Symmetry: C2
Subunit: 98 residues, 2 copies
């Protein structure tokens, strides 16, 4: 199912907004909710960094790369949440009128 991919971007943004997280930690938090192929978040993270929705920084002592929401990414997340809701509301109006 391909609707699951654009959803990872939204779950990752939402969790990153709560807390600065590193990679494996984010994958294990998404996995509480949806069954994510291990490795599937990293291209999502790389895109959100490239698009400057997230920035990144390292912490040492085994160095670790933390992800941070930017201002741009905070606006984008809030649009994505509003899109998601009224999108799934629309689909549910289809699935129960037919």
């Amino acid at each position: 199912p391909q609707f699951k991919k654009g959803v990872l971007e939204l779950c990752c943004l939402f969790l990153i907004q709560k807390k600065d997280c590193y990679g494996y930690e984010l994958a294990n938090q998404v996995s509480k909710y949806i069954e994510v192929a291990e490795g599937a978040i990293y291209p999502v993270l790389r895109r959100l960094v490239k698009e400057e929705y997230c920035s990144t920084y390292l912490v040492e002592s085994p160095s670790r790369k933390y992800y941070q929401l930017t201002v741009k990414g905070e606006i984008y997340l809030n649009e994505l949440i509003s899109e998601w809701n009224n999108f799934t509301d629309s689909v549910a109006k289809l699935l129960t009128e037919g």
Copy 2:
């Protein structure tokens, strides 16, 4: 937003299950519910035919190509509906616990 693409497959299957439809008629019924780029359903239809989820037939007098759910496509739709619900249930457990 890319979650919207895998959803067209599900809305198209659901409508085709109700009634045999032709192309433009299906696009205008999806548009009651979600804002679909005009033309975006045709690759979705072509895939569902290729994968034998749908079959097709023509009617004349301006010939018109009607779409029909196969048995395979009826099982596939029912899985897709169950996937959709428990998927969006999972996402909503994320979006309101954080």
